[model samples]
Target: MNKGELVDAVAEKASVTKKQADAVLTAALETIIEAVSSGDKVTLVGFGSFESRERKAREGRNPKTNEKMEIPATRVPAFSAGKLFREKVAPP
Candidate 1:
């Protein structure tokens, strides 16, 4: 679901106003992004981890023109689901 829907769910579950839930969620998302962007990893033990990863330069295709292109290396944000989340998605 999109973030607005997520906020609604959180608000109902937490018995809080939509504004309150929205504020907390927005702050959390921004905080995670800031931390990952600055080379820091954020881990929520039962949820997941967010971090930055380095990617190597590689060859890629331009689908529009079917042309080969050199894709530049870059750093990107990454997420890894924790054991609990994985289990929840697919029961062991």
Candidate 2:
């Protein structure tokens, strides 16, 4: 679901107002971003973890232009699912 729909669902499930739930969700997201940006992994049991992963510099091709290019290394945010989340999302 989108952010607005997620906010509505969280509000309903948590018995909180949309405003309150939205604020909390926003804060949680911001906190996770900050932590990951600082190279700290955020882990939530039964949910997932957020972290910054390092990527090596590599060669690439511009598909449309058929041009060769060097892709610079960088750190990117990543998430890995927990056991429960994986089980819940897996197809029966």
Go through the candidates in order and give each one's C-alpha lDDT: 0.97, 0.96
**lDDT over C-alpha atoms for residue 68 of model 2:** 100
Q: Which residue pairs in candidate 1 collide?
A: none
In terms of TM-score, the best-performing candidate is 2
- For model 2, where is the 10-residue window of minimal lDDT? 83-92
Q: Which tens-of-lDDT digit does each residue in 1-92 have in candidate 2?
A: 89999999999999999999999999999999999999899999999999999999999999999999999998899999998999899945
- Candidate 2: where are CA atoms >4 Å away? none
Model 1 TM-score is: 0.90
TM-score for each model: 0.90, 0.91
